[PDB]
Design a protein around this nucleic acid. Structure first.
Length: 62
DNA sequence: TCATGTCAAGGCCGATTATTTTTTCCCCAAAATCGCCGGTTTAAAATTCCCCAGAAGG
């Protein structure tokens, strides 16, 4: 639930940001939002974040 | 058909490979210990030879 993709739960239903909704309709992909304060529903990407931040960005210097 | 947690690393165990140390086996030579047989010595037991008494036979 990022404000760059939504604008709050209008009584349970989600209100999509108009510009982002236009962007999604342009590329055709349907957006979805998991839920407030529940990151389990997107465990794949969070675990990938753990993977990258404990494998790549641990000692690499730039 | 919605929404819905997933992946990697670390630790432990087992098996395999490599290195080192210890123990055993086989063959030969020398020394020591043990076993068997024979001979010698000691102790105990058996047999035969002379005079006194008793019993039996002619």
């Amino acid at each position: 639930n990022m404000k760059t993709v939504t604008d709050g739960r209008e009584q349970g239903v989600v209100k999509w940001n108009q510009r982002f909704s236009e962007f999604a309709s342009y590329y055709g992909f349907i957006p979805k939002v998991c839920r407030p304060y529940r990151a389990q529903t997107k465990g794949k990407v969070e675990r990938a974040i753990q993977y990258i931040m404990d494998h790549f960005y641990v000692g690499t210097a730039f």
